C-alpha cells in the first residue's frame, strides 16, 4: 500500500538542514532551490485580470485548453516537440507532480527505474511511491556530470522499465549535449523504456550549452514524458504550475490520477501563464534573469576553485556542485562545518544520491553580494581548518 511505500522513502537531508539553519541567524543560505527573483510584474497583472474576469471556478482535470494550446506552441517552437494540446498536454500543480503521476501511468511491481545521480530529490521517492525500484546510475565529475550511456548499460536488467533524465541538471548544472541525448535515445529504444525528461531549467543555460528535448528526437515522443513548468522560467515557484507532454495513453492515466489528487490547477493562474507565454516581456524577463544567474555563476565557480575546491563550471540551472571529498570530510560533515563555523548553508551532495557523496550543492539563486560573502566565509574556514 502507499503507506508502506512511504515508510520506505527516507527523511530528507535538505529538510534536516533547514531546521538546523533555523536556530541560527547570521547564516547566508546557499541551499535555496528556487529563483530569488519575483514573478515578472506583467505576469502578476495577467493573474489580476483573470481574477477580474471571474476565472475562479473548476477547470478541466487536464488543464485550461487555452494554456495547453499556448504550451503546444512553446513546445513546438522552442523544443521541436509536436504535441496535441487536446490530448497530449496536461497542466499540473507544479512539475513535481509529474514524477509520481507519470510513473503511475505504467510502472509495475518491482520494475526498475534508472536514475542518473546526483539527481533531483523527488525522483527516487516517486519511483518508490509508484511501486517501482529506483536504480541510481552515477554520473562523473570527469564527464562534467553528463550522463554516460556506458554507465547506464551497467545497470540495465530485465526489470528496467524507465529512465529519468534531468537537463539542465539539479544539483550539478550539467547539460546533456545533442549527441548525449541521441545515444540516450538509442539506449531507451533498445531496452524499450519510457524516458521522463525534466526540463524546468531549460532557459538557464550558459557558455555553449543548448537545450535539446529527447522527445523531439526520431521515434521518441511515443516513449517520453516531457516535464517542464513555469516555476524556474518565470520565477513562479509559489504559483504551483507545471506541465507534461506525452502520448495520450499516458496523459489519460495522469488525468484520472489527478481526479483523486489535486483535481485541476488554479484557473486564474493558468490564464496568467497562457498570456505570459505569448508576451514578449516574458522572454525579456527570462533573459535578464539568465544574465544575472550567469554573472553569479562565474563568481562562485572562480571562488570555489580558487579557495581549494575543484569545481566543474555548470552550463545550466543555477547550481554548482563543488568537490569537497579531498578535505577529508563527508558531505554531511562538510555542511555541518560550514553552517556552524562559516554560517553558510550548503546542501550535502549525498542528498542527491550516493554519487553525490564527496560533493556539496550550492545554489547561486541569491544576491551576488551574499554569494561574495558566503564564498569568503567558506574559504576562511577551509583555510583555518587547514582543509585545503
Ligand X SMILES: *Cc1c(COP(=O)(O)O)cnc(C)c1O
206 is in an annotated binding site: no
Nearer to ligand X, 95 or 375 (CB): 95
Least distance from ligand X to the Cβ atom of residue 170, Å: 3
Nearer to a copy of itself, 145 or 239 (CB): 239
Q: Of the candidates 240, 286, 243, which has an alpha carbon nearest to the alpha carbon of residue 73?
A: 243
Handedness of CA 214, 216, 219, 220 (dihedral sign): positive
The three state secondary structure string of the chain is: CHHHHHHHCCCCHHHHHHHHHCCCCCCEECCCCCCCCCCCHHHHHHHHHHHHCCCCCCCCCCCCHHHHHHHHHHHHHHHCCCCCCCCCEEEECCCCHHHHHHHCCCCCCCCEEEEEECCCCCHHHHHHHHCCEEEEEECCHHHCCCCCHHHHHHHCCCCEEEEEEECCCCCCCCCCCHHHHHHHHHHHHHCCCEEEEECCCCCCECCCCCCCCHHHCCCCHHHEEEEEECCCCCCCHHHCCEEEECCHHHHHHHHHHHCCCCCCCCHHHHHHHHHHHCCHHHHHHHHHHHHHHHHHHHHHHHHHHHHCCCCCCCCECCEECCECHHHCCCHHHHHHHHHHHHCEECEEHHHHCHHHCCEEEEECCCCHHHHHHHHHHHHHHHHHCCCC
Q: Should residue 237 be labelled a site residue for a copy of itself when binding is judged by CB under 8 A?
A: yes
Q: Should residue 265 be labelled a site residue for a copy of itself when binding is judged by CB under 8 A?
A: yes
Nearer to a copy of itself, 19 or 208 (CB): 19
Among 74, 76, 159, 256, binds a copy of itself (CB under 8 A): 256
Q: Should residue 348 be labelled a site residue for a copy of itself when binding is judged by CB under 8 A?
A: no
Nearer to a copy of itself, 155 or 257 (CB): 257
253 is in an annotated binding site: no
x/- letters, 123..142, toward a copy of itself (CB under 8 A): --xx--xxxx----------
Q: Should residue 111 be labelled a site residue for a copy of itself when binding is judged by CB under 8 A?
A: yes
Interface residues toward ligand X, by CB under 6 A: 33, 94-96, 120, 166, 170, 198, 200, 229, 231-232, 237, 242, 263
Least distance from ligand X to the Cβ atom of residue 50, Å: 18
Question: Which partner, a copy of itself, ligand X, none, binds residue 266 by CB below 5 to 8 Å per kind?
Answer: a copy of itself
79 is in an annotated binding site: no
Please, what is the angle between helix 368-384 and helix 280-307, to 10°? 20
Least distance from ligand X to the Cβ atom of residue 110, Å: 25
Q: Should residue 105 be labelled a site residue for a copy of itself when binding is judged by CB under 8 A?
A: yes
Least distance from a copy of itself to the Cβ atom of residue 140, Å: 27
Nearer to a copy of itself, 1 or 25 (CB): 1
Nearer to ligand X, 120 or 212 (CB): 120
Nearer to ligand X, 166 or 350 (CB): 166
Binding residue numbers for L-glutamate: 33, 58, 170, 361
Residues that bind a copy of itself (CB under 8 A): 1-4, 6, 9, 11-12, 34-35, 38-39, 44, 47-48, 51-52, 54-59, 93-94, 96-97, 99-100, 103-109, 111, 122, 125-126, 129-132, 235-240, 253, 256-257, 259-269
Amino acid at each position: 500500500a502507499l503507506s508502506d511505500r512511504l515508510e520506505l522513502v527516507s527523511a530528507s537531508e535538505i529538510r534536516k538542514l533547514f531546521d538546523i539553519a533555523a536556530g541560527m541567524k547570521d547564516v547566508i543560505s546557499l541551499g535555496i532551490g528556487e529563483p530569488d527573483f519575483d514573478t515578472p510584474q506583467h505576469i502578476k497583472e495577467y493573474a489580476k485580470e483573470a481574477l477580474d474576469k471571474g476565472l475562479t471556478h473548476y477547470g478541466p482535470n487536464i488543464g485550461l485548453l487555452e494554456l495547453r494550446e499556448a504550451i503546444a506552441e512553446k513546445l513546438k517552437k522552442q523544443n521541436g516537440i509536436e504535441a496535441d494540446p487536446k490530448t497530449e498536454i496536461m497542466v499540473l500543480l507544479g512539475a513535481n507532480q509529474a514524477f509520481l503521476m507519470g510513473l503511475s501511468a505504467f510502472l509495475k511491481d518491482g520494475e526498475e527505474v534508472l536514475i542518473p545521480t546526483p539527481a533531483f530529490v523527488s525522483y527516487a521517492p516517486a519511483v518508490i511511491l509508484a511501486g517501482g525500484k529506483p536504480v541510481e546510475v552515477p554520473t562523473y565529475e570527469e564527464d562534467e556530470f553528463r550522463l554516460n550511456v556506458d554507465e547506464l548499460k551497467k545497470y540495465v536488467t530485465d526489470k528496467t522499465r524507465a529512465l529519468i533524465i534531468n537537463s539542465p541538471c539539479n544539483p550539478t548544472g550539467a547539460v546533456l549535449t545533442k549527441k548525449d541525448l541521441e545515444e540516450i535515445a538509442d539506449f531507451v529504444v533498445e531496452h524499450d523504456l519510457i524516458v521522463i525528461s525534466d526540463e524546468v531549467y531549460e532557459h538557464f543555460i550558459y557558455d555553449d550549452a543548448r537545450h535539446y528535448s529527447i522527445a523531439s528526437l526520431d521515434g521518441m515522443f511515443e516513449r517520453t514524458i516531457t516535464v517542464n513548468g513555469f516555476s524556474k522560467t518565470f520565477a513562479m515557484t509559489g504559483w504551483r504550475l507545471g506541465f507534461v507532454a506525452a502520448p495520450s495513453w499516458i496523459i489519460e492515466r495522469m488525468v484520472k490520477f489527478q481526479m483523486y489528487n489535486a483535481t485541476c490547477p488554479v484557473t486564474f493562474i493558468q490564464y496568467a501563464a497562457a498570456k505570459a507565454l505569448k508576451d514578449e516581456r516574458s522572454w525579456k524577463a527570462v533573459e535578464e534573469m539568465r544574465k544575472e544567474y550567469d554573472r553569479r555563476r562565474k563568481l562562485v565557480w572562480k571562488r570555489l576553485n580558487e579557495m581549494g575546491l575543484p569545481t566543474v563550471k555548470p552550463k545550466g540551472a543555477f547550481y554548482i556542485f563543488p568537490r569537497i571529498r579531498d578535505t577529508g570530510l563527508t558531505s554531511k560533515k562538510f555542511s555541518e562545518l560550514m553552517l556552524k563555523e562559516a554560517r553558510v548553508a550548503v546542501v550535502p551532495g549525498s542528498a542527491f544520491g550516493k554519487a553525490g557523496e564527496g560533493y556539496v550543492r550550492i545554489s547561486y539563486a541569491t544576491a551576488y553580494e551574499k554569494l561574495e560573502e558566503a564564498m569568503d566565509r567558506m574559504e576562511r574556514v577551509l583555510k583555518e581548518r587547514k582543509l585545503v
